[PDB]
Design a protein around this ligand. Structure first.
Ligand SMILES: Nc1ncnc2c1ncn2[C@@H]1O[C@H](COP(=O)(O)OP(=O)(O)O)[C@@H](O)[C@H]1O
Ligand SMILES: [Mg+2]
Ligand SMILES: [Mg+2]
Length: 232
């Protein structure tokens, strides 16, 4: 019976029930798979333009918030700032691009990030064979896959007002997964987590990140902030 003091193990709360996350696996559309293999396995001198492409996608998503308010004003009542955060993590070798844009639903991840061919994909691959600069990518409707210039794996966590939170992930190799994400709620918007290749760790350094934002992304139209972890 009587106790005056308990040890931590004794008062540890019972876990919450384990949750199921549904996972689905999809092949990339053929030309997207071919483009990813070309991007991954070819040397380019201008790999830094991946960040321009990801920032442009965030800016497009943030522009959609403003305009969706013309057909659904309730979004004006959100208190979230429309912004982009860049978050390098040296410990994990990741660079994360976070925005408070519209987010993507599950079917948006499946249809917009791998299973549908952009009409320009074949033309762009021929331009690259003919020696085009990789910087031309986004003009061909396939800018997202520039992430694989620097990343060995990409994870996209996203939440749109009309669906639950999802995670898309791919290490290339011809397929990607989409799985419900019952982890840390991120609130409306998208987080693209780049797991950087070992020779691409310059993109974790604050001066390099500032250099490429100022070179290539000066008309975002929204505040961008770079979080720098304090050196211990
Ligand atoms: N940060 C993001 N927020 C919302 N949707 C995104 C984001 N990044 C990519 N997307 C979705 O992925 C699609 C493909 O992106 P991309 O390959 O850059 O082509 P594009 O920007 O020309 O449409 C976008 O059209 C958009 O629907
Ligand atoms: Mg784009
Ligand atoms: Mg703009």
């Amino acid at each position: 019976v009587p106790r005056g003091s308990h040890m931590p193990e004794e008062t540890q709360t019972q876990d919450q029930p384990m949750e199921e996350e549904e996972v689905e696996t999809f092949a990339f559309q053929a030309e997207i798979a071919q483009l990813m293999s070309l991007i991954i396995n070819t040397f380019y001198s201008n790999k830094e333009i991946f960040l321009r492409e990801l920032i442009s996608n965030s800016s497009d998503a943030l522009d959609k918030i403003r305009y969706e308010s013309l057909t659904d004003p309730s979004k004006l009542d959100s208190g979230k700032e429309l912004h982009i955060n860049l978050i390098p993590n040296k410990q994990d070798r990741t660079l994360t691009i976070v925005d408070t844009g519209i987010g993507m639903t599950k079917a948006d991840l499946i249809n917009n990030l791998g299973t549908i061919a952009a009409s320009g994909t074949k033309a762009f691959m021929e331009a690259l064979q003919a020696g085009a600069d990789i910087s031309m990518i986004g003009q061909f409707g396939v800018g997202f896959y520039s992430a694989y210039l620097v990343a060995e794996k990409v994870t996209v966590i996203t939440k749109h007002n009309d669906d639950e939170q999802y995670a898309w992930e791919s290490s290339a190799g011809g397929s990607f997964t989409v799985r419900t994400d019952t982890g840390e709620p991120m609130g409306r918007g998208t987080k693209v987590i780049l797991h950087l290749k070992e020779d691409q760790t310059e993109y974790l350094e604050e001066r390099r990140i500032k250099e490429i934002v100022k070179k290539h992304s000066q008309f975002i139209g929204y505040p961008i902030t770079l979080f720098v972890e304090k050196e211990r």
